[PDB]
């Protein structure tokens, strides 16, 4: 039976796992549902075949609650929606070494390439690897072929989590593609035709191993950082001015092959993510599935606009025939900044309010009010008083025939003062 780890990550920052999220895992077989706190390495569980569901009961301060993940365990494998689980990672994260071999020398034209990146395989050998982010820091310098590494000044030793390169789109900063799967194919085929191993046959006449590696790396950038393969535009671009014309031409051949319709011959590649977000993620040239186990990966959204707002409803009844102890009812529909219904709990000065598919219902009598709290920037409301029968209705002193009002793009606190009038 199947090993899984439940790991909580923050969208956009994978340098460590996101701790203190309250998580619940639910199934439907003979399996005991359980609650736990997301932690720095993952939650290890051994599971029988069946269908399970991970739910976030709530999130660390400053994060949205994520959508529940449903997955199925079958015959030692994990499936989700239907595909086979793409998240395969090592058990001790940020434990793999990668380094830039600071003492290796070989030029592009006039100047040492010096982007000689490697990750250490479990058995001690070194695989060639390539940067995925052209502006972040390279793997730590080693002066002795990867046996010792310069630490980072602030976070210390920089090590990496080894994952299967699937779903690599999210680590790109400025990619050309918009389809994740298309993107992945592009990447695997660049690697397919580029430099992978010491002493391999260089299909391209007159290039050194190092010049191919440079070509390969620039091709990756084409796709990951939208690098323009043009000698003019490259003059000052991370040392690629020193790239001669034929070496550049190969880089083009790699991009053009990858863009073509052939399936990738590579099924899978190692990928590495560093424990410092200013450093670059690395795409490997080899594939080592022995160490990788299934991860149920849930990604929490950083709360992007820390500013939140209040919305107050009031009821006042007037005229000689107005029932001051009638409960008037209000249907409230909220949509967020990006035009999406709110399926979440909401805080008030009284008891809390669950919103189901953008909606919720409250009531008030003459003199009662209710303040909603902590609604996002750019939110919009639609609010209706549902039982106005008999009463002339004004909202913020405006006659409102169908007892309904709306407002989009709200950048501050807002008030809806309903008047219910009934004269005899």
Author numbering: 290 to 319, 322 to 372, 377 to 719
Give sentences copied directly from the paper behind this entry.
The root mean square deviation (rmsd) between the Cα atoms of chain A of the Spy0125-CTRCys426Ala structure and chain B of the native is 0.65 Å. The Spy0125-CTRCys426Ala structure displays the same overall secondary structural elements, with slight differences only apparent in flexible loop regions. The electron density defining the position of Ala426 and Gln575 shows no link between these side chains, as expected. Tyr516, that is in close proximity to the internal thioester in the native structure is located in the same orientation, but no longer forms any hydrogen bonding interaction with these residues. The structure reveals that the only consequence of the Cys426Ala mutation on the protein is the removal of the internal thioester. There are no significant rearrangements in the overall protein fold that can explain the ∼75% loss of bacterial binding previously observed in the adhesion assay.
In M1 Group A Streptococcus (GAS) strain SF370, pili are comprised of three subunits, Spy0125 (minor tip pilin, also known as “Cpa”), Spy0128 (major pilin), and Spy0130 (minor basal pilin).
